[PDB]
């Protein structure tokens, strides 16, 4: 009965497989599909720019994380939850976190570990909602995300 988690997972997972496989996801949207569709469109704009801007830095971070299986994804979750609980919250950090998740998801596809992509999207979501829930509901959730970036 967690709508915020459900909607957030739907958005973040679709973005991660899209970036990994290079093909859009035509699977029909869920309950608030209008907002989710536009948030996914927003992510394509701001998430691709973040990944391009920080390609060398994202690669250096991924190389130090050494992600090859699901247990390495778990060690990433530890890092994500620590920095997303440091008391600093803004939309730019949320975009950056999902953008790096898409970067990692591209790497998992390259090393034939596509089965680790869904666990990755779930862990980013769990970190997002657990640490930023009260802020997110104040910003009107993914409606605020869409309005903030256009």
């Amino acid at each position: 009965s967690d709508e915020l988690y459900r909607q957030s997972l739907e958005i973040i997972s679709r973005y991660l497989r899209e970036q990994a496989t290079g093909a859009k996801d035509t699977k029909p949207m869920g309950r608030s599909g209008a907002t989710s569709r536009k948030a996914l469109e927003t992510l394509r704009r701001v998430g691709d720019g973040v990944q391009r801007n920080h390609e060398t830095a994202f690669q250096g971070m991924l190389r130090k994380l050494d992600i090859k299986n699901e247990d390495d994804v778990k060690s990433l979750s530890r890092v994500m939850i620590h920095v997303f609980s440091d008391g600093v919250t803004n939309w730019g950090r949320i975009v950056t976190l999902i953008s790096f998740g898409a970067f990692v998801a591209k790497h998992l596809k390259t090393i034939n570990q596509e089965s680790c992509i869904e666990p990755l999207a779930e862990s980013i979501t769990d970190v997002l909602v657990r640490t930023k829930r009260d802020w997110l509901v104040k910003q009107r959730g993914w409606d605020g995300f869409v309005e903030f970036f256009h």
């Binding site: 920080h54 830095a57 250096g60 971070m61 130090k64 890092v79 730019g92 950090r93 950056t96 976190l97």
Partner: peptide, 16 residues
Amino acid sequence: PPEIAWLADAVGLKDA
């Protein structure tokens, strides 16, 4: 880079 140092520090990459 400064804009993502908070994330890269946690990972251990020093020159962000």
